Design a protein around this ligand. Structure first.
Ligand code: ADN
Ligand code: CL
Length: 345
């Protein structure tokens, strides 16, 4: 029985362009498995190149948007979740806009000045590798000015739970920082996601600062290793990282518990908190090879599944099962597609 606007999200609204990629694409653009990179000049030809390929799949993306709208989808109560992002004045942006409205998700999109187009993600899918090349585009123009608007900042003030992916660091760090301060100041729930290895390597200052305001931190194995390496944790890196992130002081120096969850693919995930001296394993649902359709967005769904239950009072273990369920649902589907709500269970 949550009030409207209980969950607030801010991120980069993107369009996923999913394509069955040939093998040369990964050598040509120097791409790695299960990795994401921001588009540089040497990557720019990839978008025109994949349009030459048949059977393209266009579907709404954005890490934060995926999580927040699945939370809304799970709760089934209209207008519980809110989302703020920046799109372009194109058909892609309007598609994403209408996609949100269809899920009863309250949105206040910022519109970038033309001809800056809505961001896109080149999702290259193959039997051997899966990789993403992101062109942020209009998402970069997300301003603090748009957020501090009375009709937008009111969504933040009435919210009790926040989810902001680490990806937002590249687009509007000043915005997510202001919200995180507001959350800790009013003792709210701030959920943070490490999102990608490059964020811990190249934006270590921003990641650590965000952690100091975060009550819950989500991450995976590759992110934990990247984080751990930069912090000089050369042994038991994944475990040490979980302990390190959980033990970091909050910004005000006050004593709170921070929950840290690190997923590890098919292997048992890890979880712990500031008050716990131990790191626990949680075994997950096993998949066969011919059961997996697309693991893209499984982490975003995992966050949605956990939060949706955890904020409704359900205990830790139960919430972890809900998270795995959310991820498993997405894994058996192409892209981040939210189907009929009745067919969830
Ligand atoms: N740099 C980024 N910022 C926000 N979302 C992203 C970024 N890169 C990939 N994503 C999204 O992550 C999802 C998979 O977790 C995809 O749907 C994709 O759109
Ligand atoms: Cl995002």
């Amino acid at each position: 029985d949550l009030s409207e606007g209980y969950v607030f999200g801010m991120g980069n609204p993107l369009l996923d362009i999913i394509v069955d990629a040939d093998d040369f694409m990964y050598r040509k653009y120097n791409l790695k498995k299960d990795n994401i990179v921001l588009a540089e000049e040497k990557h720019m030809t990839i978008y025109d190149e994949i349009q030459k390929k048949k059977k393209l799949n266009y579907i709404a993306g954005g890490a934060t948007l995926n999580t927040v709208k699945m939370i809304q989808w799970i709760i089934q109560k209209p207008f519980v979740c809110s989302y703020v992002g920046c799109i372009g004045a194109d058909i892609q942006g309007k598609y994403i806009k209408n996609d949100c409205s269809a899920l009863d998700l309250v949105t206040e999109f910022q519109i970038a000045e033309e001809p800056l187009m809505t961001g896109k993600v080149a999702v290259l899918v193959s039997e051997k590798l899966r990789s993403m090349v992101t062109y942020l585009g209009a998402a970069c123009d997300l301003s603090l000015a748009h957020i501090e608007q009375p009709h937008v900042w009111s969504l933040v003030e009435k919210a009790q739970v926040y989810y902001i992916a680490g990806f937002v660091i590249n687009t509007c760090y000043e915005g997510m920082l202001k919200i995180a301060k507001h959350s800790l100041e009013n003792e709210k729930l701030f959920c943070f996601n490490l999102s990608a290895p490059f964020l811990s390597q190249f934006n270590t200052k921003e990641v650590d600062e965000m952690i100091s305001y975060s009550n819950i931190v989500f991450g995976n194995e590759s992110e934990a290793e990247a984080y751990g390496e930069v912090h000089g944790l050369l042994e038991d890196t994944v475990h040490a990282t979980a302990r390190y992130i959980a033990d970091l002081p909050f910004a005000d120096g006050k004593k709170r518990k921070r929950l840290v969850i690190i997923t590890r693919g098919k292997n048992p995930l890890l979880y712990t908190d500031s008050s716990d001296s131990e790191i626990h394993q949680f075994m997950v649902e096993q998949f066969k090879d011919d059961q997996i359709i697309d693991t893209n967005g499984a982490g975003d769904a995992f966050a949605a599944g956990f939060i949706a239950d955890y904020i409704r009072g359900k205990p830790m273990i139960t919430s972890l099962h809900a998270a795995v369920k959310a991820a498993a649902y997405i894994i058996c589907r192409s892209g981040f597609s939210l189907g009929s709500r009745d067919s969830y269970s």
